[PDB]
Design a protein around this nucleic acid. Structure first.
Lengths: 192, 53, 124, 56, 53, 58, 151, 52, 128
RNA sequence: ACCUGUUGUGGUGGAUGUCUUGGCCCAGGUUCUGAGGAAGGACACAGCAGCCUUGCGAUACGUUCGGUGAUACGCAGAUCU
RNA sequence: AGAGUGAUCGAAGGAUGCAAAGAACUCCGCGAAGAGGGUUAAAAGUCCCUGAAGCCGCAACAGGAUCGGUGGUGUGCAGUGCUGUAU
RNA sequence: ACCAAGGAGUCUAAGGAGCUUGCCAGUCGGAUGGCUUCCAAAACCUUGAGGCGUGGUGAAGGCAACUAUCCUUCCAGAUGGGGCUAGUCUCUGCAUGGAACGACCGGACCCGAAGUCCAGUGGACAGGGUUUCGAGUGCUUGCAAGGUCCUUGGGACCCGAAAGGUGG
RNA sequence: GGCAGCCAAGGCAGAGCAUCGUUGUGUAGAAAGGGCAUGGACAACAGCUGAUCGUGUUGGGAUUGAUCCCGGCUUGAGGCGUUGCCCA
């Protein structure tokens, strides 16, 4: 026997959990690209195609606009390995090249009403095989209604949303879980 | 099942019906089948006999 | 819902077959007509009856012929002119034959029998 | 009660809702919905045929 | 109707239990001409999808 | 009827997971070699009988 | 693939625990029915820590109680100024840009009663609604339009 | 420029509908079929007082 | 490959012992089929010195010879002439084991066609 | 001879496999008992009948009449075309 | 059916055969059986589709003092299969 | 004692956290409505209120997220651009974590209520400060279905009290 | 994981193929690690079956194992199996 160190297990994810055969085709294409072009962009896109669906979150035309707002990205292609949905709050879009896994009808209309293009990842692989002039943006995994509840509300400093199953009080003063440990009146309030 | 997903299932089943390397895979004899998908003149909608069918 | 009477339930159909009365076993024990009779009367099948001739057409007595002498509707059997069999002792007994095997060679032609032939013969 | 963070149960099934051997139960299963749809349609058109030359 | 394996269906209501029986895909369909012409109108398909190769 | 130029991965996913035929979906069945090359010929359009038949060119 | 080849099982863990005597619940501490209470039992005695840690504001009574709480007279869906110009056919938004006429936005048509004043406004519009914030009023008035109280 | 589909028994060539260029999603098909096949099931249950 | 496994490599299998369920020899209710012991005091499970062998993966055999029979050939359960025609190209790797229910009439045709194709039928002489 | 074992065989035993005039379940319809005597309970009633029968009541395994149309049957016995 | 004074409790229990063709006749015996001889595709013999395990009888063969055991191990010796097999 | 057959984590309402699929500021809508021998109580359809989400905060009276070219700031940081060079500089800055806010929304304080204004009963906001709180916002992270492991109510993994009650 | 020097092989992208390296105890417990097996629905095997199903019994072979296949006999159908998936 031997006093072992930890036997290596690779943390990284190397198989698409997606059940869509066309997502699997894209994983095949970008395995090829991350091997025989070997750019950081191609390796990143391969990672993100592997990612489960929680971790390739939806992203808005507002995020596309915020990414491309700088004059440096006049010809760049905004790449999101995600479903792209439209921010109704965004009114005037610039002509933008945007590659994604899916564009909502609204996002596609908003991007093609400004003269932009809605690219699929195979089109991106044939246009920029090295992913040059491609602005990768992800999408935010906080702000989830689960992430807000993560932790404990009764822990001082943790501002976790208490788990309320289906009970949405109508009187916000006589709400559920708002009295003892929520006001110093009731002998203590959870610290901030 | 959401209606969108059921309609997508119908669409995909039709596409696979159009691809013939799956009709034979499911086990149909495409020996005498001229084309896939198979289209037929509307005169058969006025068929009255199983012999003519 | 399927309408009443036209049900393909195995259990119900078998119950009916095994609890039918004699007036229903009369029509369950129908036999096919010969081609002579079939052309002559334009009728294809009738309930078998005592006193008419049959050809066996099936079973270990196929190709034999004779007049029906007993419809044993309780057993769904039919006894024939001379299809007999000796017992352990010399006593000759009759062999029951399901009338689906036999075809009909002649009829007795009572009044109701002729009326039945006519009513089924008029094509509609 | 959970050893976790799940919400407070608030289950509301304390009063013999279950059709067991001892109880009749408080359960109504709507298996008639399918057949009753067609039956309602049939009686509606029978209403039409009854009061025919008038709005249904 | 009486022909043993044959099933009947209409473009107005396409049954997936008939387009993919057993869950298996690639069944022989023998659309008539107007059914064929109305397929994408009924299913409300406007475009062809850009699928990777 | 060039309905779709389907990828090999997608075609074979459909065959493996939506047909229920041992000689095709079992990679280690002593009919899968012949069946795989046969279905590849069938998808290419012509399968031999080495004269090659014409088979539903889709 | 190979993973997809495994569309198997219906009660995977239960059927896997067959052959193992304690059925995944231990030999020392058995799986015994209700060893801690039924429901929320003990919220102040032996589940005191759990209730304190995962549900602070439990166990109390706060606020004015309102007998016969009507909610229809309190129903008031709100929108924002950022989501206004989406509600104007951009033909109007174009033919009214620099000119004096302003398109009319009837929020009740879309199901909003109050108008909240978050989001910038590009050109003045006339907004009919049942209530407005003073921020929304300020932004609309500065953009050029007007707020209108409508039943 | 859609492909042409001939009509058997009658010399005629229609176009090919855009349905048949859609995604061959066997997985969606299998899911939806195994969940629609459940919609014709009819309840079964033992007697209520059975065994008591 | 249409290659029969040689005796050279058949004799290099790794001597799987005759595994049994523990105490399957005390009682007729305890069957012979293996079961992993889950007892707390079990000397078998604790692997005492002179106790029988414990089923494990070290006894598993290489892929080249695993499921290969003393014939040197793998087996294929056939019921039709279709399955023979399937094994047509692998008459040296595989041997056509007819199914136990296949009657004499189809066994005759299977044996005929398989001896034209020169595929070995492990149960050629079954019924006449 | 006795014991232990392994086969073959014969017993004891009724597991298995296959089925089912049975159950259970869902849907639809009806709910139609009684002082003019109900539901139930007795005692009777068959050539050979004890039981059973949602058979029957001293007209007692049945009476009138209709539909059907040659059987019924475990034996016999005269009616029946 | 059965149990309890009673209120009540309450079982076990399916399958011959295509057809009763339900085992004629002979010997022996008081008789049942049995030995023949029959029906039948077959006794499938009114215990009747099949007939498992446990247990038992018999014959053959192999051993028989010893927890020196059941079981494992590596050979051996007898009996018994299986696979392959050069010129 | 022996053998055989039976024999114990199940379904349901609500929910949690992953995973899959579809759609997207929407999503779902099988209460119901349109159709068509059995199959079919299926399938199909968008007549659909409404559920959840888009805003939170206050006990309540109530109030309701600044920013006119664009853009909250800082530290680390995924990509990518332009120079450059096997020394190696600038621009971009996603996700995540931490900090901040001269920011803002609602509540609570303190000094005030100066100032502007009018759908004018004197009312509406407004200023500057705080060791302030929120399950707040800072380019809406949603909905539905399925699946896995679970939770609580249910017989509740299976068997098991001495007991309590109602009527005979 | 075809855009390969050629054949042979592999050819299902969480698969497969080639090389190399590491590491192998385990109660409770776990595995979005992999499989064997039972009843039935939806499908496929133009699957098998009176030239004898299934059960059972006895030998043989395969398997690390759950278990699988076959020969003999019983037995004779009031039949059975293999694969995918779903309901238990």
């Amino acid at each position: 026997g031997i006093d072992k160190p930890k036997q290596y297990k690779n943390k990284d994810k190397r198989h698409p959990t997606a059940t869509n055969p066309y997502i699997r085709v894209l994983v095949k294409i970008y395995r090829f690209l991350a091997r025989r072009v070997a750019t950081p962009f191609n390796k990143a896109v391969l990672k993100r195609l592997m990612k489960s669906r929680m971790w390739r979150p939806r992203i808005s035309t507002s995020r596309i606009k915020l990414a491309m707002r700088k004059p440096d990205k006049k010809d760049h292609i905004c790449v999101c390995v995600s479903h792209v949905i439209h921010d109704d709050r965004v009114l005037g879009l610039k002509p933008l090249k945007v590659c994604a896994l899916k564009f909502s009808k609204g996002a596609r209309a908003a991007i093609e009403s400004a003269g932009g293009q809605c690219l699929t990842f195979d089109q991106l692989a044939m246009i920029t095989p090295k992913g040059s002039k491609c602005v990768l943006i992800r999408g935010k995994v906080t702000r989830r209604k689960q992430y807000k509840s993560f932790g404990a509300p009764g822990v001082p400093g943790s501002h976790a949303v208490p788990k309320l199953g289906n009970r949405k009080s109508a009187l916000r003063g006589r709400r559920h879980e708002n009295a003892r440990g929520r006001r110093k009146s009731r002998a203590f309030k959870v610290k901030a | 099942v959401p209606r969108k997903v059921r309609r997508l299932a119908v669409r995909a089943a039709l596409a696979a019906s159009a691809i013939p390397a799956l009709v034979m895979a499911r086990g149909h004899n495409l020996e005498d089948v001229p084309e896939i998908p198979l289209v037929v003149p509307n005169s058969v909608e006025a068929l009255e006999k199983t012999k003519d069918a | 819902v399927n309408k009443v009477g036209k049900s393909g339930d195995r259990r119900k159909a078998r119950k009916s077959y095994f609890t039918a009365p004699s007036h229903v076993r009369r029509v369950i024990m129908s036999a096919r007509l010969s081609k002579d009779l079939r052309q002559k009367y334009k009728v294809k099948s009738l309930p078998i009856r005592k006193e008419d001739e049959v050809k066996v057409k099936r079973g270990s007595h196929k190709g034999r012929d004779g007049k029906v002498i007993a419809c044993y509707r309780l057993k769904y059997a039919v006894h024939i002119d001379k299809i007999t069999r000796e017992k352990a002792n010399g006593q000759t007994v009759q062999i029951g034959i399901h009338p689906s095997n036999v075809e009909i060679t002649k009829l007795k032609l009572d009044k109701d029998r002729k009326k039945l032939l006519e009513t089924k013969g008029r094509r509609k | 009660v959970k050893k976790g963070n799940a919400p407070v149960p608030n289950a509301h099934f304390h009063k013999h809702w279950n059709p067991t051997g001892s109880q009749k139960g408080h359960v109504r299963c709507f298996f008639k919905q399918g057949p009753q749809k067609k039956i309602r349609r049939a009686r509606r058109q029978k209403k039409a045929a009854a009061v025919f030359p008038r709005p249904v | 109707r009486n022909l043993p394996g044959v099933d009947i269906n209409f473009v107005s209501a396409l049954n997936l239990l008939r387009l993919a029986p057993g869950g298996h895909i690639g069944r022989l369909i023998v659309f008539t001409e107007d059914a064929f012409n109305q397929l994408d109108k009924v299913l409300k398909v406007d475009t062809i999808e850009g699928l990777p190769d | 009827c060039k309905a779709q130029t389907v990828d090999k991965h997608v075609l074979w996913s459909c065959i493996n997971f939506g047909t229920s035929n041992v000689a095709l979906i079992d990679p280690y069945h002593p009919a899968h070699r012949g069946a795989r090359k046969y279905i590849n010929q069938f998808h290419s359009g012509k399968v031999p009988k080495k004269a090659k038949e014409a088979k539903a060119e889709e | 693939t190979y993973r997809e080849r495994k569309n198997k099982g219906q009660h995977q863990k239960t059927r896997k625990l067959r052959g193992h005597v304690s059925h995944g619940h231990g030999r020392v501490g058995k799986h015994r029915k209700h060893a801690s209470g039924r429901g929320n039992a003990g919220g102040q005695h032996h589940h005191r820590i759990w209730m304190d840690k995962y549900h602070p504001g439990y166990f109390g009574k706060v606020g004015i109680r309102r007998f016969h709480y009507r909610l229809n007279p309190r129903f008031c869906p709100t929108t924002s100024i950022s989501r206004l110009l989406r509600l104007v056919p951009k033909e109007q938004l174009e033919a009214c840009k620099g000119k004096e006429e302003l398109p009319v936005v009837n929020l009740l048509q879309h199901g909003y009663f109050k108008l909240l004043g978050t989001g910038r406004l590009s050109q003045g519009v006339i907004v009919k609604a049942r209530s407005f914030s003073q921020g929304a009023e300020r932004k609309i008035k500065k953009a050029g339009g007007a707020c209108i109280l409508v039943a | 420029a859609r492909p042409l589909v001939t009509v058997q028994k009658e010399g005629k060539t229609v176009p090919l509908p855009k349905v048949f260029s859609s995604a061959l999603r066997y997985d969606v098909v299998r899911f939806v079929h195994t969940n629609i096949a459940k919609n014709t099931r009819i309840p079964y249950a033992v007697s209520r007082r059975a065994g008591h | 490959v249409n290659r029969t496994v040689t005796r050279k490599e058949l004799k290099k299998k790794k001597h799987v012992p005759h595994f049994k369920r523990y105490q399957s020899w005390r009682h007729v209710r305890v069957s012979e089929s293996w079961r992993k012991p889950h007892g707390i005091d079990s000397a078998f499970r604790r692997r005492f010195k002179g106790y029988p062998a414990m089923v494990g993966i070290g006894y598993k055999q290489p892929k080249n010879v695993r499921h290969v029979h003393p014939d040197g050939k793998r087996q294929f359960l056939v019921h039709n002439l279709k399955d023979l025609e399937v094994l047509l190209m692998y008459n040296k790797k595989y041997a056509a084991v007819i199914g136990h229910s296949v009657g004499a009439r189809k066994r005759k045709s299977i044996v005929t066609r398989a001896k034209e194709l020169q595929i070995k039928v492990t149960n050629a002489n079954a019924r006449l």
